Design an enzyme around this catalytic site. Sequence first.
Site, PDB file in Angstrom:
ATOM      1  N   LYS A 194       5.112   0.508 -24.063  1.00  0.00           N
ATOM      2  CA  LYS A 194       5.173  -0.628 -24.991  1.00  0.00           C
ATOM      3  C   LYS A 194       4.047  -0.480 -26.017  1.00  0.00           C
ATOM      4  O   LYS A 194       2.877  -0.302 -25.654  1.00  0.00           O
ATOM      5  CB  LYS A 194       5.048  -1.932 -24.217  1.00  0.00           C
ATOM      6  CG  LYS A 194       5.147  -3.184 -25.098  1.00  0.00           C
ATOM      7  CD  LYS A 194       5.149  -4.429 -24.226  1.00  0.00           C
ATOM      8  CE  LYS A 194       3.764  -4.679 -23.632  1.00  0.00           C
ATOM      9  NZ  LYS A 194       3.684  -5.991 -22.924  1.00  0.00           N
TER      10      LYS A 194
ATOM     11  N   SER B 157       7.083   1.083 -16.094  1.00  0.00           N
ATOM     12  CA  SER B 157       8.146   1.791 -15.384  1.00  0.00           C
ATOM     13  C   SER B 157       9.327   2.064 -16.317  1.00  0.00           C
ATOM     14  O   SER B 157       9.765   1.176 -17.053  1.00  0.00           O
ATOM     15  CB  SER B 157       8.678   0.903 -14.256  1.00  0.00           C
ATOM     16  OG  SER B 157       7.640   0.609 -13.347  1.00  0.00           O
TER      17      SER B 157
ATOM     18  N   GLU C  94      20.872  -0.961 -17.587  1.00  0.00           N
ATOM     19  CA  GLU C  94      21.291  -2.311 -17.176  1.00  0.00           C
ATOM     20  C   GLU C  94      22.261  -2.319 -16.018  1.00  0.00           C
ATOM     21  O   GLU C  94      23.271  -1.633 -16.071  1.00  0.00           O
ATOM     22  CB  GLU C  94      21.808  -3.113 -18.400  1.00  0.00           C
ATOM     23  CG  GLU C  94      20.664  -3.663 -19.239  1.00  0.00           C
ATOM     24  CD  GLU C  94      20.844  -3.856 -20.736  1.00  0.00           C
ATOM     25  OE1 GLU C  94      21.898  -4.390 -21.147  1.00  0.00           O
ATOM     26  OE2 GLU C  94      19.876  -3.588 -21.486  1.00  0.00           O
TER      27      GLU C  94
ATOM     28  N   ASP D  12      14.156 -16.621 -18.689  1.00  0.00           N
ATOM     29  CA  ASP D  12      15.224 -15.953 -19.438  1.00  0.00           C
ATOM     30  C   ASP D  12      15.875 -14.861 -18.616  1.00  0.00           C
ATOM     31  O   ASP D  12      16.105 -13.754 -19.084  1.00  0.00           O
ATOM     32  CB  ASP D  12      14.748 -15.464 -20.828  1.00  0.00           C
ATOM     33  CG  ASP D  12      15.897 -15.207 -21.804  1.00  0.00           C
ATOM     34  OD1 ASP D  12      16.855 -16.022 -21.833  1.00  0.00           O
ATOM     35  OD2 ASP D  12      15.810 -14.236 -22.579  1.00  0.00           O
TER      36      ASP D  12
HETATM   37  O1  MP7 Z   1       5.209  -5.477 -20.782  1.00  0.00           O
HETATM   38  C1  MP7 Z   1       6.104  -5.860 -20.018  1.00  0.00           C
HETATM   39  N1  MP7 Z   1       7.439  -5.955 -20.351  1.00  0.00           N
HETATM   40  C2  MP7 Z   1       7.908  -5.545 -21.691  1.00  0.00           C
HETATM   41  C3  MP7 Z   1       9.342  -5.085 -21.516  1.00  0.00           C
HETATM   42  O2  MP7 Z   1       9.312  -3.954 -20.618  1.00  0.00           O
HETATM   43  C4  MP7 Z   1      10.393  -3.129 -20.634  1.00  0.00           C
HETATM   44  C5  MP7 Z   1      11.615  -3.335 -21.399  1.00  0.00           C
HETATM   45  C6  MP7 Z   1      12.649  -2.383 -21.277  1.00  0.00           C
HETATM   46  C7  MP7 Z   1      12.455  -1.335 -20.443  1.00  0.00           C
HETATM   47  N2  MP7 Z   1      13.385  -0.311 -20.188  1.00  0.00           N
HETATM   48  C8  MP7 Z   1      12.785   0.541 -19.266  1.00  0.00           C
HETATM   49  O3  MP7 Z   1      13.347   1.543 -18.812  1.00  0.00           O
HETATM   50  N3  MP7 Z   1      11.508   0.010 -18.945  1.00  0.00           N
HETATM   51  C9  MP7 Z   1      11.320  -1.132 -19.679  1.00  0.00           C
HETATM   52  C10 MP7 Z   1      10.252  -2.011 -19.741  1.00  0.00           C
HETATM   53  C11 MP7 Z   1       7.733  -6.524 -22.862  1.00  0.00           C
HETATM   54  C12 MP7 Z   1       8.371  -6.269 -24.132  1.00  0.00           C
HETATM   55  C13 MP7 Z   1       8.174  -7.201 -25.178  1.00  0.00           C
HETATM   56  C14 MP7 Z   1       7.326  -8.305 -25.027  1.00  0.00           C
HETATM   57  C15 MP7 Z   1       6.675  -8.552 -23.798  1.00  0.00           C
HETATM   58  C16 MP7 Z   1       6.888  -7.644 -22.701  1.00  0.00           C
HETATM   59  C17 MP7 Z   1       5.775  -6.211 -18.631  1.00  0.00           C
HETATM   60  C18 MP7 Z   1       4.461  -6.096 -18.269  1.00  0.00           C
HETATM   61  C19 MP7 Z   1       4.016  -6.296 -16.914  1.00  0.00           C
HETATM   62  C20 MP7 Z   1       4.948  -6.714 -15.968  1.00  0.00           C
HETATM   63  N4  MP7 Z   1       6.303  -6.822 -16.318  1.00  0.00           N
HETATM   64  C21 MP7 Z   1       7.236  -7.192 -15.255  1.00  0.00           C
HETATM   65  C22 MP7 Z   1       7.545  -8.626 -15.215  1.00  0.00           C
HETATM   66  C23 MP7 Z   1       6.584  -9.650 -15.606  1.00  0.00           C
HETATM   67  C24 MP7 Z   1       6.923 -11.031 -15.458  1.00  0.00           C
HETATM   68  C25 MP7 Z   1       8.226 -11.304 -14.946  1.00  0.00           C
HETATM   69  F1  MP7 Z   1       8.572 -12.585 -14.789  1.00  0.00           F
HETATM   70  C26 MP7 Z   1       9.118 -10.303 -14.588  1.00  0.00           C
HETATM   71  F2  MP7 Z   1      10.315 -10.592 -14.100  1.00  0.00           F
HETATM   72  C27 MP7 Z   1       8.809  -8.956 -14.726  1.00  0.00           C
HETATM   73  C28 MP7 Z   1       6.809  -6.647 -17.606  1.00  0.00           C
HETATM   74  O4  MP7 Z   1       7.987  -6.778 -17.928  1.00  0.00           O
END
Ligand code: MP7
EC number: 2.7.11.1
Length: 278
Positions: free
Chosen positions: A36, A85, A91, A130
Amino acid sequence: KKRPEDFKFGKILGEGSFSTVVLARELATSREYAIKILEKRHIIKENKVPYVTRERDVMSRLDHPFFVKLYFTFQDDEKLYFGLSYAKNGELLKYIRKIGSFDETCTRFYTAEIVSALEYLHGKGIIHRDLKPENILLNEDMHIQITDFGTAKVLSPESKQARAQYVSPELLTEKSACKSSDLWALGCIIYQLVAGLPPFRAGNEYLIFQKIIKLEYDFPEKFFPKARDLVEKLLVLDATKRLGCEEMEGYGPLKAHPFFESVTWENLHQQTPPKLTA
Ligand SMILES: O=C(N[C@@H](COc1ccc2[nH]c(=O)[nH]c2c1)c1ccccc1)c1cccn(Cc2ccc(F)c(F)c2)c1=O
């Protein structure tokens, strides 16, 4: 510490809230991460960029088999990088377009993994807000990897509440979310795995919202009877009456529902997931 030059950056995996998630291969190891990237230019008060301030530290510290994990961080002059990860299989519900609805064995397994993940998250006082199929990815081993795109919130001990097709009535009628809002989303997801379509369907979003608030939905004839019972117990307008919620005695009665007969809840992450097809 790792640096941008240690990776070969590939395609965009996702984007939201001034954060772009890019597939990257670590040059030295061939290991793939979802990195990210946040531009420092966007980190201003008005933007409310998630994961920069302390309010999400509990989320950043999660080390659970069912959530995407934060492995490393680094920065350069212009950007912040967060190594997450990579969920190779994408999906979970993507198989429906080919295979259609899931069978009972697969629905039971993947529903158990989601329930186990929500129990852990709720146990930390985190609410997703969400939860939808787009946020339930699958790793190479076919186990779930739940993502947050900046909607998840840590509740304060002073309140059980915080401020389309998978949205609960309280997020529509009272603009509030609670742990039970995620159980409503779970009900929608179970229904979609079994039926092949989400429960609240109509000509447009405006009409879908009306169906949600009025609980206007029906089950197809082939719906597994135990799954139908479970969905009816989750898709309840009153958030305090949903199976699994605090007011209904928490996760025990939900995990003990007849739909989950034969589930070994303690080792789901170690079990070989049932194949959706041979
Ligand atoms: O940084 C975290 N999540 C990211 C998204 O992460 C992605 C998106 C697509 C992907 N495809 C793939 O293969 N790996 C990918 C990773 C994020 C993006 C935009 C804004 C804020 C966060 C992120 C940082 C740390 C922990 N978690 C897990 C989490 C936190 C709170 C919850 F309630 C929950 F259900 C899960 C994150 O999603």
